Amino acid sequence: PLDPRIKKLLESGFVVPIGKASVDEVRKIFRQLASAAPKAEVRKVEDIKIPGSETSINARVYFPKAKGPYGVLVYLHGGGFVIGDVESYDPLCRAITNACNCVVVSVDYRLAPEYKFPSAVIDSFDATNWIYNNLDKFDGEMGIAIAGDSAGGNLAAVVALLSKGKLDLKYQILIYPAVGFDSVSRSMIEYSDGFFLTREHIEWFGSQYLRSPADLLDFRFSPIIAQDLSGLPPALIITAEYDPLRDQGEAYANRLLQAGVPVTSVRFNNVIHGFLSFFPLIDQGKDAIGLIGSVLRRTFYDKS
Amino acid sequence: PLDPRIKKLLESGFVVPIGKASVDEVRKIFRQLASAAPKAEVRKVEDIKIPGSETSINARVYFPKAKGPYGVLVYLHGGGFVIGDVESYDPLCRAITNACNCVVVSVDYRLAPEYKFPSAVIDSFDATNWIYNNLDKFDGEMGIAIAGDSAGGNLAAVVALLSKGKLDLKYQILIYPAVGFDSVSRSMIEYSDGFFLTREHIEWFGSQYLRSPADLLDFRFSPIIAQDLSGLPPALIITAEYDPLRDQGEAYANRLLQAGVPVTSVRFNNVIHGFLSFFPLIDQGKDAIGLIGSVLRRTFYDKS
Amino acid sequence: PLDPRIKKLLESGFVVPIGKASVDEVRKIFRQLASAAPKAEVRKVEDIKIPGSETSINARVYFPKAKGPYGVLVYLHGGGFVIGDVESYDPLCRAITNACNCVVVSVDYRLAPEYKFPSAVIDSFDATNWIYNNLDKFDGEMGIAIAGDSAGGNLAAVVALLSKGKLDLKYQILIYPAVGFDSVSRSMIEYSDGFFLTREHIEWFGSQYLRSPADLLDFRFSPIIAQDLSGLPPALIITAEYDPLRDQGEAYANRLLQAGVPVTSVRFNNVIHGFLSFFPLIDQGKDAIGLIGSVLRRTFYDKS
Amino acid sequence: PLDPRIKKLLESGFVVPIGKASVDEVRKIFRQLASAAPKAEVRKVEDIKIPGSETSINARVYFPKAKGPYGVLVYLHGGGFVIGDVESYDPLCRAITNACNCVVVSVDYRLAPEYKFPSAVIDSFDATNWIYNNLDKFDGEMGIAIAGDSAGGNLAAVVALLSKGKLDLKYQILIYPAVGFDSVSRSMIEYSDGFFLTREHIEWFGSQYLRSPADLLDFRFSPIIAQDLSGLPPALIITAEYDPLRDQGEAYANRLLQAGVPVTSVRFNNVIHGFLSFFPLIDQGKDAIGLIGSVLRRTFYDKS
Numbered sequence A, B, C, D: 001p002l003d004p005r006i007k008k009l010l011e012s013g014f015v016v017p018i019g020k021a022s023v024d025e026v027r028k029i030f031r032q033l034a035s036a037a038p039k040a041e042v043r044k045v046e047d048i049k050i051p052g053s054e055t056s057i058n059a060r061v062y063f064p065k066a067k068g069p070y071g072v073l074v075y076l077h078g079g080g081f082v083i084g085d086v087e088s089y090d091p092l093c094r095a096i097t098n099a100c101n102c103v104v105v106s107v108d109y110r111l112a113p114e115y116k117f118p119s120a121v122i123d124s125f126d127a128t129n130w131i132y133n134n135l136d137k138f139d140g141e142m143g144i145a146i147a148g149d150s151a152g153g154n155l156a157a158v159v160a161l162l163s164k165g166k167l168d169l170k171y172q173i174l175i176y177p178a179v180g181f182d183s184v185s186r187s188m189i190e191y192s193d194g195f196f197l198t199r200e201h202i203e204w205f206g207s208q209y210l211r212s213p214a215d216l217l218d219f220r221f222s223p224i225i226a227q228d229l230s231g232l233p234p235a236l237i238i239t240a241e242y243d244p245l246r247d248q249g250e251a252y253a254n255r256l257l258q259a260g261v262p263v264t265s266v267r268f269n270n271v272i273h274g275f276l277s278f279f280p281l282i283d284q285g286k287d288a289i290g291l292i293g294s295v296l297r298r299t300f301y302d303k304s
């Protein structure tokens, strides 16, 4: 069952009214929910503009208190390709920065419905490419990794595919990712309602982001159907027991493993989709952040 | 775990070498495996030709020993849209006839690769339509139901969708059906190899049957994504515990239930995909046939 | 998910208030719930007294309309060893009689708390032994089988063990059985509350029936830990997807299979514990009864 | 599926021949498998003797390079209550020490069959009590936590129960623990063979350790049936996807959560029982050690 703390929270009306309110209103509600978490101190924070192929991309850079050199984690926020932003994810990105002792660059990719697929992918890739080529600006010579949650985990997985034989990504962290279209998995059906992220929400996000059903078959939306997953960066894949997206994330882990990619796939039991965003309340979220910290300290620094 | 009888069978090389031999050779191997089962006596067997929209459709009609009037079960064989035929399914159709005390009409729909999607769907629908309009020829006034296994269960489900507000199908029986494209379910991943029907086979069948990836999004291949499942006939859906297709069949059951369609969804534990075809060996297959008999005797005759 | 029909029912307060009302009151509530189902006609019904080792055992005998000779199904009602009786199970036993075309003998074994374990086992065994030795009285020469639901499925499984090398039981039907003590299975934990049979109820029944914790290790309460399951009668084991007892019933199926006993293990999806008792409402219950009919017609008559 | 690395390992004969060789030989085989892992540097290692109630208890103390004050993790090795020792666990305890920046005290509790249950429990409790009362000897004033793997996770869970209202344990880490007797869970049945720890091994260990079947009902062997789990220390519970013990560990997590105890329950996918002992090969084991590090650094130091 759910952790009673989470059941209590859900029973008290913790919702984001996706598809039942205006885009502006759902963005506002999400901002207030996510941004309420404590902002842990880091050493320095900078807002930068990355020259993308299609737009000037805003990004926020978090520097850790630890001395350099650093690795750089490119972070892609979730929010169904429609909501969220760098500022609402500030508390989480600060927590990650402190866990990993690395530089985190959180990317404000273009959002749907204003900018449909593949805009978010293009921005995410362009940002990652620029950061790779400008690691010196962050004393970030230990290299680059990519991470994201939910829709941002989709983007991270896709960026890792697109980066093959261009960038040298050291690691990919996929936090309860969406990895394509799923009308069949048990978790999707079983947890379609009542667990914060619902099937109705998923469908609504899909309707805003994608241009046509053909986009469902594009590997830049459905990395699970990419032709060749071999040679991708080692992965940490975090899933949540009561998440409709659970099974598809675990499927992607399995597909990567079958392609010879190292993967640590961990299901956090008793919790829901989005649980890292609610780390102050949900203790397991702090522990997931600590696991991310471990894997990145190892990969970048060969430190415990 | 698998029933030890089935494990023994699999360990002895029970395969159909799908995608590793010629189409002719795999058809021949399947014919010999399936047609080896005993042919139980029925009252009468007739081969007929149904005038389809695109072809003359061969069908075999089995009459039960019980006196009429009958219901008529349209049966659509499995074989990945590529292999199988009415004659290889003769033992199974005779067993079904005797279980249900009804007329069974087994349809030789056009097969891939010679005839790609949607040829099998067109033939299956045209046959069902003709049988409905000619029930009097079989003393079949108690009505029409549709059934099929695996690829034939896909076709049956699709025919039921296409028949909405045209025919009056009384029942749909989906025996370990394929219901669309699945790259994510746990059963698909977990039982991808070693359980008779493999992922490699599934992919090969898909490559022979479908014309392009767009066909994956056609509801006539993926009934699970049909816009509206309401008003379809009551269903019996049989799945197998160790079948890659298990989860998607159970998902379709759930979607039908959510649309207000009565569904009895039963997972046969300890067995594999195709188990009804191997009823002489696999006892559970006889019991699945008996369950089909029960549901059809009830729906057609209001008899136990 | 649950069949919406069942969710609707549960949401409307369908409970038996086990452990929250007097024994008399919970017995009365259960009687009214179970006995409300239609009583289908059979050919003849007789109440008999079986001379048990410890008591005169009441039993009800149902004769089918079909002509003899018959097999005889000994039926052991559920109710947690505390509630239920032959009369509350009359509708279900009539339905079974008509499905199987056999004689059904429903046994009023002694109930807890008035008669603790192993009283119910002794009565169930003594009744089965007497019926075996008196099959001629029922024109029942096709033989004897045993069946029961829940606590009655526990008793049936135990009787089959005790009958080894004494009686010639042809078949055992275990309908969502309890097979011992379970504090660990996923189904027990996941469906501990909200699905009609709850963990609190299970614990309460255990407290009334068993004399001490040592009884938990007695194979006559926990057949799953019997030393040797080989040579037992072929089994049909029905489980329910949303039943705390699901996993343990499927475990027992697996243990029997491993001991070379034929088993057809079927999970009825979308339904709860007790669903056969509520066959008029829950359609899947009618289909489970039909499956029981199939297996018994085959075993007794070699008929479809 | 299993990580291909692990499948490869298993297919190459990675076994410990529990119950198929002498106790001496199985101890020797395990020692060579476990002790082959690299011994990472720590600051200092001391062997000590703890005055237990029934024996002088050997323990090894590992000090981290980080400066004090420290927390102290009491570590209880696995090995089915029969095999393993402090020395075979040296590589793992050094890895843990470095991950957590704390003192680790690995306890050589008495082993079966020479010393049956509850000897291991008594020694483990006595050691933990002594360490609590002697934290000053290790500059360990940040407090005490308890951890163990498999049989050692059983002991850790039991020590936490016994310590209620005596010691102030800050945390309990249960690494793929055994939590009692399980003849019913799906994982126990499904992964009974072929996944390193087998049911036959489990039964053999039980036969050596326990004195009689009554011991199965003793909460000091089956903490899952303890009367009251409330007030126990916060827990990290790690399970492995392909471990027969998986479901029972997840059940214990759920029971603790229901009793208001904080629990982070994480299933490591694609891996087997014992995977932390094989961290040099199995990368996921390094990441599990990092997760342990995170939770202990937080609890002891309020550090990331």
Ligand SMILES: CCCCCCCCO[C@@H]1O[C@H](CO)[C@@H](O)[C@H](O)[C@H]1O
Pocket (backbone or CB within 6 Å): A079, A080, A081, A150, A151, A178, A180, A181, A182, A202, A203, A204, A205, A206, A207, A208, A209, A210, A211, A212, A213, A216
């Ligand atoms: C966390 C965000 C995951 C979003 C996954 C969306 C899955 C696809 O969503 C789908 O896409 C289509 C195209 O717009 C639509 O026709 C459908 O409404 C929808 O189901």
Ligand SMILES: CCCCCCCCO[C@@H]1O[C@H](CO)[C@@H](O)[C@H](O)[C@H]1O
Pocket (backbone or CB within 6 Å): B079, B080, B081, B150, B151, B178, B180, B181, B182, B202, B203, B204, B205, B206, B207, B208, B209, B210, B211, B212, B213, B216
């Ligand atoms: C029992 C038969 C089920 C067949 C299910 C096939 C699922 C779709 O199969 C797919 O279709 C595509 C189009 O040809 C191909 O590109 C792929 O190889 C394949 O995975």
Ligand SMILES: CCCCCCCCO[C@@H]1O[C@H](CO)[C@@H](O)[C@H](O)[C@H]1O
Pocket (backbone or CB within 6 Å): C079, C080, C081, C150, C151, C178, C180, C181, C182, C202, C203, C204, C205, C206, C207, C208, C209, C210, C211, C212, C213, C216
């Ligand atoms: C459908 C009926 C199943 C009943 C299963 C009971 C499982 C054992 O129940 C137990 O037995 C003990 C002895 O009385 C008690 O100490 C406990 O309260 C209880 O959990």
Ligand SMILES: CCCCCCCCO[C@@H]1O[C@H](CO)[C@@H](O)[C@H](O)[C@H]1O
Pocket (backbone or CB within 6 Å): D079, D080, D081, D150, D151, D178, D180, D181, D182, D202, D203, D204, D205, D206, D207, D208, D209, D210, D211, D212, D213, D216
């Ligand atoms: C990782 C080690 C877990 C050991 C769990 C043992 C579970 C109980 O094991 C049992 O205990 C009994 C008493 O000795 C025996 O009668 C049985 O052989 C055995 O199944």
